[PDB]
Copies of this chain bind each other. A is one copy, B any other.
Amino acid sequence: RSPGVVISDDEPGYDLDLFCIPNHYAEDLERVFIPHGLIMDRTERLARDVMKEMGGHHIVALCVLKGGYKFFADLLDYIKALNRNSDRSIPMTVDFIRLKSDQSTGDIKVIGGDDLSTLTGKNVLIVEDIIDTGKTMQTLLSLVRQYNPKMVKVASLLVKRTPRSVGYKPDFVGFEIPDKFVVGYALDYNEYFRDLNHVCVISETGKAKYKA
């Protein structure tokens, strides 16, 4: 059971001054955990891992849409580049499950719940950007399985190494990270950090500056 690229507690970040970061976030971050390009190369591998398990068949790519879908979009770009070479053209269904608004994350409020029965009898790939406690995903899996898919696998860019974890482990994991609050790449903080390319740890002045 590969936990992905492990970012240790004892290593962890890169120094902020080692990478290009927008000047308006100078004081808003602690460390860079995962540079943009590292995310990309790992995602390229995830796509290949996904195709070994699910390739050659239709498959339904389902984005867990909360703040954004940047990871979904990049994973799909890589999966699509792998599909190019196949002798037969393989159809690909792209869908989003939108979840509405972090201490009761297990309670899901789905907004777009139309023709959920399109999942029935289908090979479903659920794509998440971050798993923390894992409560959201385990309840989302309860919903999805009631529609009887042929197969359900979950890919998550990030899994947080927390005691608060309920023990849910995704089938595909990009990176296993320390138990710190991260922003950037695909993760916004109240609509900020959208322009930050790298997964980084928010600072306390960032937390205070950008609060809702």
Contact surface of A with B, Cβ cutoff 8 Å: 2, 4-5, 8, 11, 14, 17-20, 22-25, 28, 35-42, 44-45, 48, 58, 63, 65-70, 72-73, 80-81, 83-89, 91-96, 98, 100, 110-115, 190-195, 197-198, 210
Contacts and interface: CB of A to CB of B under 8 A. Distances in A.
Contact of A192 (B24, B37, B91): B91
A100 B115 contact: yes
Contacts of A20: 41, 44-45, 48
A181 to B, nearest CB: 17
Contacts of A44: 19-20
A205 B74 CA distance: 31
Give the oligomeric copy count: 4
Contacts of A48: 20
A195 B37 contact: no
A45 B69 contact: no
9 cross-chain pairs, A with B, having the tightest CB-CB distances, nearest first: A37-B37, A91-B191, A35-B41, A24-B89, A22-B84, A83-B195, A37-B41, A80-B195, A37-B40
14 contacts: A2-B18, A5-B18, A22-B83, A22-B84, A35-B37, A37-B39, A37-B40, A58-B191, A65-B112, A66-B94, A68-B94, A91-B190, A92-B194, A100-B115
